Design a protein around this nucleic acid. Structure first.
Ligand SMILES: [Zn+2]
Ligand SMILES: [Zn+2]
Ligand SMILES: [Zn+2]
Ligand SMILES: [Zn+2]
Lengths: 797, 797
DNA sequence: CTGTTACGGCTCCATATGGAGCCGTAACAG
DNA sequence: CTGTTACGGCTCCATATGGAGCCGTAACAG
């Protein structure tokens, strides 16, 4: 009846152990990336997944992949578990919101049972060929490439290579497309220098859609081989379509869709079903009409249902389940959604909420549920609704482990596990355990210290004012915006906030950023609706802050990203011993040959292949992971070597380089970034989202002052303790005082309190918004009665 | 707290419903393939697997495969479940008995912690390259092809095609190997007519192992293409090795291993580890020495452990877990096994028992466990041990659903679910529910009828005697046989039985059957140890009875298998209307063109492809599944058509053809096969193991009398009710009275009682046997005190 | 009339080159 | 000394033909 773990040594697990009670509401929190989150993510979940997947069918076990065994000694009292992560999937257009909502099939069954034609339940579905629209083969649209995007260079000759698609080059002899181009030219007797615009329509059709698969001879003359073969040219369009059909990568899919556009099927149009299916009328509405309705209006519509007595009797189960699913969806809070809406077009938090609602509807109790950041992407009322839903799910009879930072969740929690006190070598130990009251009584918990109010976010005594430099965006009607006009000043720590799903963040991410990037940084991406933008001359450069990893290659290090490695190499080159040895400054760098270990090429790992086992990585024995030649490593400066510096700690580095101001300024920048515990040479892939964000903000701070720069941060409060939030707020204020501009779209109460100009967009999400709710100083905004954000700010202040 | 299902319509589920209590021991039983087993296998398990796999990671969901949705209305109160099926997997040689037993890692950790060199725990393992034997790369053997099996025809010329391996033909110009042969001949200037024996050693080495990958020109002259290319010939051996490495099919793997043999690595030899690893001595033994020990002797060895006080203190967990695992393995009853034994070399029942033991050791409680036929492959004492283990696992806190026929399991069960009364259209309804007592009180349950003793297997009043015709096998020492001599008479319903894992069944399946097949049916398979076989002239033909499907293609039907379709076609051809129409007798057959529907080619299904969906099968609209042309189907004989006859029922067919003795004799043979409920034209793939066995026995019965035939049945009692066992026994007696011979190796008490001559091999499984325990009439055998089977027979009698 | 063998026909299963992002280096301007 | 731009180099990710078993048909013997 307990989750007992002993001898855990994952990452920074200092052989910690704890007894987790079953069938309760326990929350684990700590410092940003302190290791408690990693432990909870990768010890219990990994043990359960291994103990389950293995015991399953062997073939399915290798199909789903063999999970790596953990370093924990033994785990007792475990159970099968599910993970509601934050990394969404592109999925396929065949997937639908109703399909993943576990409501489309129920709606189809209800329509088949109760609805009348103007009758098999299979015909109501749109995934089986027994009832499909042939025009779009059930897809709803028509993914066709754009002839104006593949080879728009009409004036360019055929030999010039107007078509820029990969594998279709015509100016390269070594290209695989050169043989096909030569065969087509032989079959057409047309000069390759003819312009694309001047090409005959028949020749253009043959090039695009192929030569109807007729027999044709293609000549091949390689360096050491020659001959000819009979084949057919499908054409550029057909080749691209086949490649897209055979594609299985999200990046390749996005690249291919960049040159294509799915034209909504005109025959069916949001139906993807046979005409006669729409004839089934239930309550004077169609299945598509029901699906396109909003969740709240759908609940209202199904509440006013009225039919025959037999229909009511048969509805004692189907309609009851439909009502329960609608109520669960309402409790999720994502009312600004449609059953017919595209599954892919959704936020990560929205996807997590939808998955939670589907799990609640399923009712599979007696399991372990591990969620991540439920508070992210929700308003205060949404937080209350999520807490109620979590309490209900716990009442269903399962033990839940959540990781978050919302104070209300901790108050509603039963047992709290805190790991600290610091991060890395400064933490990794269980500070305390028990309920909230004794956690507050505990004087060794940083979370308890923040709860007790000893350290609190003091509201600023003074607020900055605009300097007359404003950016004007008026008439934008992208997504759900109803031609809204917003006056956004620049030069202060202003922010935009509102209820969940209002779309203001979508507007900022899809219109303003795209326009600014196209204007300044020359980014060729089509933006959304945009009438006019003013104040363009005020700013010069714009940058973005996201959660993307700094680098996907192991050839990069955070020291390289910050550039301190260059100063270190220069200092090493300035050494008298280095000058005597004649070593170049470039030799003190692992990225290039000259000093790197030739055995592993500086990678530090070796690949070993087995007949019945996958690739195995082991440390390189020649250089023992030092990634430096012995002769190069023989140099010593101030009692330290280049390898030692690369393996050194930032906390030690700050005290080490007390006489190197050039390096020191970046050192103290990194220290003020609040990431001194991070290794100076940690692997780039090993970095977490918080670490990457800290690195990016440190790099931004180290940048020279310009006074005409703007920054956009997407939910910086995600994955951060209250002290981390305070540090981030201080960094934001110092960046604003530097002379740049800050744009923030978040929902943290402390961040809103620290703001100087609040922008409100509402008054409801989805179709219920599109108008600027209010604007002004936070004190003036709190005076507005018709604003949830204003009421929350007034309560906070 | 209940498993509630309503509106289930899977196969023959007549909208049945039932409430299954949770956390109990409930057993479901019924007629052979009555549908209750299929329901329990494919309703609850399918619902749980879907509700789990889906909610998991999406990418893993498509990796493991999307389970099809069931036809049930809704399932309430479900839980994640695991399935211990009977279909084993070939797996890989890297897999080990200790690995799947979850004991190899524990043993390695114990050896690392306690053992002393003559020290990292990773070096003890044999799956990581950090400690491996390079000779065999951890495999233990060396899978090399046999030069005496690839092209043994030394006298055959190179052009003749001595190498019979697929893709290496030399006598076929169109073969892909012809170009390589021509290139090799050009590079060697050797005549293709030279004998393989007369080929120079250098030429043979070049052919086998390749030409060291050197540059070579291969000429190609196709019908419409020509040219040449520079490439290298890896050789026959290298090509076969690469194909085996790239192989991913069990059938292809078996075909390739038919020409290969894994020679035990001589460097390591049952070690696959680095020399220094064997230096670690624990209790005066090696890790391999511990693994090769029997389970019981290993438990005894670890019981006498004695080390330092620190070792004992550290062993409070590791040694306790090892002892618990050993005790669980002992409770499994598979004492005749070794930790170092090959994982693949095991029986299906042994694999199921091992999986059950591993699951018990895991301790993941609060789940649903569905096993199949625990009694199969076990002795009476093993049945008691399995019942105790199941009771323990239920005490661990999980709800178990077992399907079996052992009376002891029903007695130990709490709730029993019986579905009947018949099969197919004659059953599919819940007969009764409750405990065993009220089940016996219920007069409508066939299981209760058998339990009450109203219908019982009467012991035969007289037993047949040998007619002096005997088969003598003496000195066979295959597997664990210790040069045993057995006198097996022929001409009576004799049988061989013993304790589980004795190996006598393995001896019969690996020596006697192989020798008989090679002698009579000309089967070229190498048998095991065999000194001499006598009485060969007594028998003429030998046949085998297994659980393999009758046919993997949908072009075959049970009517075609039994041959009644030929008589039906002849009768239809004899019709006056058919003679007037001039239709040939072959037209009344769907297998060939002439009368079949050209739209579906007689398949009856159509394939529809979608861009984002897999292949979909739908009934063919042109012929509506009748699989006959309209003009051909227009004929009517005795008020019925050929399509109607093909779709008719056997129970109706027996009354239909009362004036057709030629067909009637096979009709009543099929009826006596006890499978009248089966459709006369059911799909071959749709047939179950019991149905296939019934079909095979019916075909054997319909065979003309010869008096010199023998039959071998492998566990016919599997998947059969007590009445089904009675019917099978009666069929066996009638087959024996026909004039043939019957050899049975099973463990059913009723089958043993019905036997006339019992062969006993023991006295213990594995290394504890190899000697004939006893022999004689069942009454005389019961008088033997030193025989578990004899004691069981005496108790039964 | 029945069993066996041989042959033909059918079906299902099996087996290397181009592009984007990042790091290091050189050059130019303030 | 510092910031910016341009170029070169490096790495990781991406995109049809032969064989075994079965059914139907013809021929031959009892
Ligand atoms: Zn359409
Ligand atoms: Zn190295
Ligand atoms: Zn070896
Ligand atoms: Zn058809």
């Amino acid at each position: 009846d307990y989750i007992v773990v002993k001898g855990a040594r994952e990452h920074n697990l200092k052989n910690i152990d704890v007894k987790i009670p079953r069938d309760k509401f326990v929350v684990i929190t700590g410092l940003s990336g302190s290791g408690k989150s990693s432990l909870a993510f990768d010890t219990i979940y990994a043990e359960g997944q291994r103990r389950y997947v293995e015991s399953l069918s062997s073939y399915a076990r290798q199909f789903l992949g063999q999970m790596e065994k953990p370093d924990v000694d033994y785990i007792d009292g475990l159970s099968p578990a599910i993970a509601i992560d934050q990394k969404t999937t592109s999925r396929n257009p065949r997937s639908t919101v109703g399909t993943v909502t576990e409501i489309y099939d129920y709606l189809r069954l209800l329509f088949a049972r109760i609805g009348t034609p103007h009758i098999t339940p299979r015909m109501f579905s749109f995934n089986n060929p027994y009832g499909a629209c042939p025009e779009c083969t059930g897809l709803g649209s028509l993914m066709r490439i754009d002839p104006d995007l593949v080879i728009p260079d009409k004036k360019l000759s055929l030999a010039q290579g107007a078509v820029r698609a990969s594998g279709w080059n015509i100016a390269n002899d070594e290209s695989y497309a050169r043989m096909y181009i030569d065969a087509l030219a032989k079959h057409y007797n047309f000069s390759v220098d003819t312009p694309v615009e001047e090409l005959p329509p028949h020749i253009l059709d043959i090039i695009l859609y192929g030569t109807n698969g007729e027999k044709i001879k293609i000549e091949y003359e390689r360096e050491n081989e020659k001959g000819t073969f009979m084949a057919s040219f499908p054409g550029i369009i057909n080749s691209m379509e086949r490649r897209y059909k055979e594609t299985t990568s999200e990046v390749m899919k996005q690249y291919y869709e960049n040159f294509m556009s799915n034209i909504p099927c005109p025959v069916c149009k949001g139906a993807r079903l046979k005409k006669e299916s729409l004839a089934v009328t239930i309550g004077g509405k169609n299945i598509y009409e029901v699906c396109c309705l909003s969740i709240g209006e759908a609940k209202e519509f199904f509440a006013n249902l009225n039919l025959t007595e037999r229909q009511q009797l048969i509805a004692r189960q189907i309609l009851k389940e439909i009502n329960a699913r609608l109520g669960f969806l309402v409790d999720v809070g994502l009312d600004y959604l449609t059953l017919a809406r595209a599954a892919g077009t959704l936020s990560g938090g929205e996807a997590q909420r939808i998955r939670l609602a589907t799990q609640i509807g399923s009712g599979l109790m007696g399991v372990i549920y591990i969620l991540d950041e439920p508070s992210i992407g929700l308003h205060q009322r949404d937080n209350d609704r999520l807490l109620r839903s979590l309490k209900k799910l716990r009442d269903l009879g399962n033990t839940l482990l959540v990781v978050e930072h919302d104070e209300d969740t901790m108050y509603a929690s039963d047992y709290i596990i805190d790991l600290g006190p610091g991060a890395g070598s400064h933490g990794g130990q269980i500070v305390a355990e028990g309920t909230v009251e004794e956690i507050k009584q505990n004087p060794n918990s940083v979370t308890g210290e923040y709860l007790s109010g000893r350290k609190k976010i003091e509201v600023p005594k003074e607020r900055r004012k605009p300097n007359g430099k404003w950016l004007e965006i008026i008439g934008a009607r992208e997504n759900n915006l109803k031609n809204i006009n917003v006056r956004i000043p620049l030069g202060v720590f202003t922010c935009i906030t509102g209820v969940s799903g209002s779309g203001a963040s979508s507007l900022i991410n899809e219109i303003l950023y795209k326009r600014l990037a196209a204007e300044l940084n020359r980014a060729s991406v089509k933006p959304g609706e945009h009438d006019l933008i003013k104040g363009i001359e005020y700013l010069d450069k714009v940058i973005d802050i996201d959660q993307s990893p700094i680098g996907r290659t192991p050839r990069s290090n955070p020291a390289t990203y910050t550039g301190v490695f260059d100063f270190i190499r220069e200092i090493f080159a300035n050494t008298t011993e280095a000058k005597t040895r004649g070593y170049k400054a470039g030799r003190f760098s692992f990225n290039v040959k000259g000093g790197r270990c030739e055995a592993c090429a500086g990678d530090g790992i070796n690949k070993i292949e087995m007949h019945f086992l996958p690739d195995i990585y082991v440390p390189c024995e020649v250089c023992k992971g030092k990634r430096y030649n012995r002769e190069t490593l023989e140099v010593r400066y101030k009692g330290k070597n280049i390898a030692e510096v690369l393996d050194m700690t930032v906390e030690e580095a700050l005290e080490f380089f007390k006489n190197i101001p050039r390096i020191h300024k970046k050192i103290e920048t990194l220290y003020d970034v609040g990431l001194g515990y991070i290794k100076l040479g940690q692997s780039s892939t090993t970095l977490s989202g918080g670490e990457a964000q800290r690195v990016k903000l440190a790099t931004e701070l180290s940048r020279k002052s310009t006074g005409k720069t703007m920054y956009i941060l997407d939910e910086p409060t995600t994955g951060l303790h209250m002290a981390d939030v305070h540090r981030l707020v201080g960094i934001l204020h110092r960046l604003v005082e530097a002379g740049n501009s800050v744009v923030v779209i978040e929902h943290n109460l402390d961040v809103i309190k620290t703001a100087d100009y609040i922008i409100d967009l509402g008054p409801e999400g989805g179709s219920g918004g599109g108008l600027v709710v209010a604007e002004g100083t936070p004190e003036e905004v709190a005076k507005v009665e018709n604003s949830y954000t204003g009421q929350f700010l007034k309560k906070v202040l």
